């Protein structure tokens, strides 16, 4: 992971089905396709992703102080580690099959659902700056304090002003 970013979302965002966790990780990494016969790269690409992660442990990293603070030559700080979970819980209304009356019929039950990436995009080798802009835009959208809303990319859109093709139903 060339770039990595950890953001803490609020209760309104966590309530959604796409943000069932409380921490979001944004990453940018480079992929290489290797020739099966001999080690020789054939194609290269950059990937921008975003997953809801959960804490699994801790580790020690160098301390980087900010303006008011000052650090020792060998000062270190401990930060948590994150991983992508397989499933996350939800709370949905239900009914008790063996309710004896009118007071124990309606209840709440918990279910597990599959976790899917928030963002998954692929960029070519000669488009590093566009990938960097996309990653920065995702980070800014998360910093604004709401859900990720803009996924538009100019390269993958259909032509504009071609009335003979855009007249067909799209809903």
């Amino acid at each position: 992971m060339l770039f990595k970013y950890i953001h803490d979302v609020n209760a309104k965002v966590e309530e959604g089905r796409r943000y069932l966790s409380d921490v979001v990780r944004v990453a940018l990494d480079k992929e290489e396709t290797t020739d099966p016969d001999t080690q020789e790269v054939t194609s290269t690409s950059y990937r921008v992703t975003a997953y809801p992660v959960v804490q699994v442990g801790e580790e020690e990293v160098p301390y980087i102080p900010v303006h008011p603070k000052t650090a020792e030559p060998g000062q270190k700080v401990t930060v948590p580690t994150y991983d992508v979970p397989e499933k996350l819980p939800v709370l949905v209304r239900g009914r008790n099959p063996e309710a004896t009356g009118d007071y124990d019929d309606h209840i709440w039950v918990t279910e597990e659902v599959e976790v899917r990436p928030l963002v998954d995009e692929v960029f070519k080798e000669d488009e590093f700056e566009k990938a960097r802009l996309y990653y920065e835009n995702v980070a800014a959208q998360l910093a604004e304090g709401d859900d990720i809303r803009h996924y538009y990319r100019k390269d993958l859109d259909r032509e504009a002003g071609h009335y003979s093709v855009s007249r067909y139903p799209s809903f």
Partner: protein, 52 residues
């Protein structure tokens, strides 16, 4: 007093309507076990109704 609407075969709907003995929740029951009705049982039932 003694109605019951589930007397059809298989426990289906019958021709009667439920009475006080059946509409009352099964939890709200005091069993005297074949004894007399003392004065404290009135308080027992009163609290059993007050707690709702």
């Amino acid at each position: 007093f003694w109605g019951d609407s589930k007397l059809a075969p298989g426990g289906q709907e019958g021709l009667q309507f439920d009475g006080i003995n059946k509409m009352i929740d099964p939890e709200n029951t005091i069993d005297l076990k074949g004894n007399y009705l003392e004065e404290k049982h009135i308080n027992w039932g009163s609290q059993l109704i007050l707690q709702n």
